[PDB]
Symmetry: C5
Amino acid sequence: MKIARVCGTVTSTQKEDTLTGVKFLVLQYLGEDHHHHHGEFLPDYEVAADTVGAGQDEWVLVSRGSAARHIINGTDKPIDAAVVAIIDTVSR
Amino acid sequence: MKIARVCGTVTSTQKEDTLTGVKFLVLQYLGEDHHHHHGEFLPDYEVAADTVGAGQDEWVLVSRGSAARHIINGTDKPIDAAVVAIIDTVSR
Amino acid sequence: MKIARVCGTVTSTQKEDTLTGVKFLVLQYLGEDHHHHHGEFLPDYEVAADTVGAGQDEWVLVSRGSAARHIINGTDKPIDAAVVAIIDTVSR
Amino acid sequence: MKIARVCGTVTSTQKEDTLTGVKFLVLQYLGEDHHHHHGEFLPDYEVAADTVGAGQDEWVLVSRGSAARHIINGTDKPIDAAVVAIIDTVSR
Amino acid sequence: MKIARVCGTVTSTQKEDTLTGVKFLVLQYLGEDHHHHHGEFLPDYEVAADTVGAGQDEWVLVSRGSAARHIINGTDKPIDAAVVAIIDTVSR
């Protein structure tokens, strides 16, 4: 889906060369439970790397298009999910 | 499926650089309910960007081929659904 | 699947620029019912464009490889199903 | 899956231009039944084209990577399953 | 999923030309059973090739992006799963 939840994630400098230059973040399809409780997840199957964007914790646009990473990385090579754009709307 | 329902969508100028130049629209596989009632949806997992086409509200052809965005965008880079063509037939 | 049923389809000149040059046809995974009755379908989710081939109505080979459209279209750009080859065998 | 069963298949010279040069073979995910009986299948949805390899009838490695067909075909264009490599191990 | 279990695998020199240069390894989505017992699997549908990385036996990052194999292979051609990066964290 276009809308997805992005969680913070940082670790010792370690990532693919092509992935280098992009911050590693954790993405989760599931979000708030019944519009209530933030909820917590342990599994990190879905991984996304992109710059810091406001409202990323709640909801943000995501895509697998290489174009998203092309602007930051370019030369084309890396394949993964990235934050092409962000939404001003935020949960309250 | 080739046939899909396209809904209007506009917001503050905010989109990927490669996506720039293409109008952001919302796509929904589900349409009229039992050939009755237009119906309404809240989820926007499926996102499509393309020019304005007649009959888009009812039914329109859609594809993920980069060729569709190549004509408008070109240089190849952006990946997503777009309206390659439209059908003259409309619901009545 | 490699084998698929192709149905005829023609309408007012309207198709993507990259799709231009290829005849628009309707493809359906489902075919004869229990080796009996031709059957009829209304939905056209699966869309395929290619030249006219014998035995297409019954069964014909299909693929999404851009190579198929490359020979007819070339320059690479359009993405969809096309009739790479046809089978001499036909239902009787 | 990497491991798949390859069956023999030959017909009148008829195949896509890009597919030309590669022998047409039939691939089937299902193999021996409960390590017993070879079994037989009629459906040929999964189609694979590659050179003749020993142990292909029993089990052989398969991939959709264009690199496999690149070595034989090259120039990149055709997309399908091919025998990148074969295993010396055979059923007995 | 980003996290996957990698198992050792070595055999007589036999692999696709494009795959040449990369060690052949076996990947399995399933790992420890209920955080207990290492467990054992016979099926090898998921195949991954990459260099030797610490913690690969337990958990390691994996991706299908050609960029991963591009650094090792380059020229682009081979398509498969590879270890883009490894995690220092290990089961204990």
